[model samples]
Target: ISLENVGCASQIGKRKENEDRFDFAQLTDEVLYFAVYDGHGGPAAADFCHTHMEKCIMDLLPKEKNLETLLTLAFLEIDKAFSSHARLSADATLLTSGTTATVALLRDGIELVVASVGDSRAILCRKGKPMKLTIDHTPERKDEKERIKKCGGFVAWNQPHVNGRLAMTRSIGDLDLKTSGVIAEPETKRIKLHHADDSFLVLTTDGINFMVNSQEICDFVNQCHDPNEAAHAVTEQAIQYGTEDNSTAVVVPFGAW
Candidate 1:
């Protein structure tokens, strides 16, 4: 697969502070990267994770080709480092803050790996169909709901909210919620890209997902020739639909293989 037009769009939406962050880079011809982060309780945690998580992945990257294991370890290391930061801080806010991370790595142009925690998601669009590459770690999920209950935490808001305070079941930071069964463990998946006529990957926070379905987003991107415009279209549409949270979208198009 070959890299084509890349674009992104973000909005503060109804929030006073935009707690969303996104970034992407091409490390080499063989490696490409992208990530979306949604912060709650504050933006500090998301900001910190966006800056340091990439470095953590680079530092822990092994010469061996265990992509999934390496990504899993990197996620754990990032949380561990952030946890240490909060422990050393005198600010109580840091303990209650948290962020959702959804990271995508396109390596060797054809191998795609995604690691995620919390409600953010990544979708792979090929030949006009949408394939979800990440699972939203919300308490609404049967497994997550049960886990939270076993840990003495209850899900409210129609089973979507955990403890009636946080809506997500997993995230980085949020020390106060960890014991309540909110974890930082990431669900990672790898795919071998067999690019055909059209292909691209869309990564976004829940803002867009809440307003648009996977197929709708895929169709929106497919109509735009430029990746940036595609990103903007979806994000702007989400805002037009009255999404309450910050909106963010990263669109990466893959050309002929």
Candidate 2:
């Protein structure tokens, strides 16, 4: 059997502004780089990541260590750069800005590394089962909830029927909250590119996730033979379902040889 590959992208949504940015590129013969950035504070932060992250990652790739570590470092480096930019501003309210992001790099077919900050997600489909590559770093996640409590931030309305928000445990920028110790560091995960794994990768912003389920997305992608088309469908579906937030999706499907 022969394998054919293509990478493509598109966007169609009412964001009030185009606040999400994504990039997919072949960095080398064995390395494929992709990223999705969702801006909350403003487009400036998202634009910064889209234009700068690739170069930053290129510079931070270590020669003799795990790629996951590089993913982590790249995330932190991007955050630090954005934060520094904020600090450089003389105005009080001007420096408080940032965006959520997720990045993936495919190292041949050996293993894949993914890192995410905030609620942006990286979901995987393997053997028809959905496995989330990047854990949602929202405050509702146990670890985040604990960390928040420790930081003197209480989980409000601790009773039943949570309003589903006040759940952002980790997020980029939020200079005010971060200065109060609500640091949003990206989480990294590594997965082997297994043989039985029909593991299709989809990187997306909260907008799409909020409107779609994992199985629904995976099943839809399974029906499409084209990665780019599948990604466009995912993005379009989000808007069709009336997603007010910026919707972005990057699909990377790995199939049998």
Candidate 3:
């Protein structure tokens, strides 16, 4: 099997600036990489990750055979590298800025690997059923709450808010919240691709998931042979469904992959 198509779309929604960003690259005949990011406070964090995370991952590729470990290291490395930027300072505004990242790596067109931080998510469709592949790192989750509290953080407003400033428990940047429990640690997973039953993979920001479920997204894009159309359709649907936050999607159909 080979990657046939890749589709991505993004909307600013109610925000003055489109803080969401995405990117993908077919690095080799057998390796492909894609990522979606949602920025909060500002777009700098997401923009930085979109521009440099891939390089960080590629540079660290030769260090480990285990994809999980490699992704973990890469996330941290990217965070530190961004922190080292001369423009980043101790100012409150800069410290509060951060972004959620969800990245996928399809290798040899048979293995699907994903790494995620914050609420950006990935769903896999097999036999027409949607399976969530990434954990939403919100403080509302029991484990997430416990981790935050252990690190002297608190959650309010039914959402996991770190120090009452951020809504997610894991993300890159957010220097202010880092000491209060927010982290950049990513949850990673791997799946063996099955051409016969695996229909497609959908990666999106919280804006889409808030308005649409996995099954619904799968159904909407299932008929589209083009990934770009599938992605745009999903984002448009989210807007129609009433999401005020920025929305974005990256769709990859199994037939093409």
- lDDT, candidate 2, at 125: 73
Question: Candidate 2: what lDDT?
Answer: 0.71
Per-candidate TM-score against the hidden true structure: 0.94, 0.84, 0.93
lDDT of 1 by residue, 1-257 (tens): 43446788898898899999888877556677789989988877788788897787776555536667777887778888888888888887888788999988888878899999999999999887999999989876899988999998887784468888898999988888888899888999999887556678999999999998999889988788688888999998998888988999988887647
Candidate 2 structure quality by residue, lDDT tens digits, 178-197: 64435656788898777764
Task: Give the runs in model 2 whose Cα sits over 4 Å from its true position.
Answer: 1-14, 90-94, 154-167, 196-198, 255-257
TM-score sort, best first = 1, 3, 2
> Which sequence of candidate numbers ranks them by lDDT, best first?
1, 3, 2
Better of 1 and 3 by TM-score: 1
Residue 230 displacement (Å), model 2: 1.4
Greater TM-score among 1 and 2 belongs to 1
**TM-score of candidate 1 on Cα atoms, chains taken together:** 0.94
> What is the TM-score of candidate 2?
0.84
Worst 10 residues of 1 by lDDT: 58-67
Q: Residues 1-257, candidate 3, lDDT per residue (tens digit)?
A: 44557788898788788889988888666668889999988777898899998788788767776777888998998888766661455554655679999998888788888999999999987776888999899877888888889988777774446777788999998876777778898999998887556567889999999998988888867766677887888889899999989999988776534
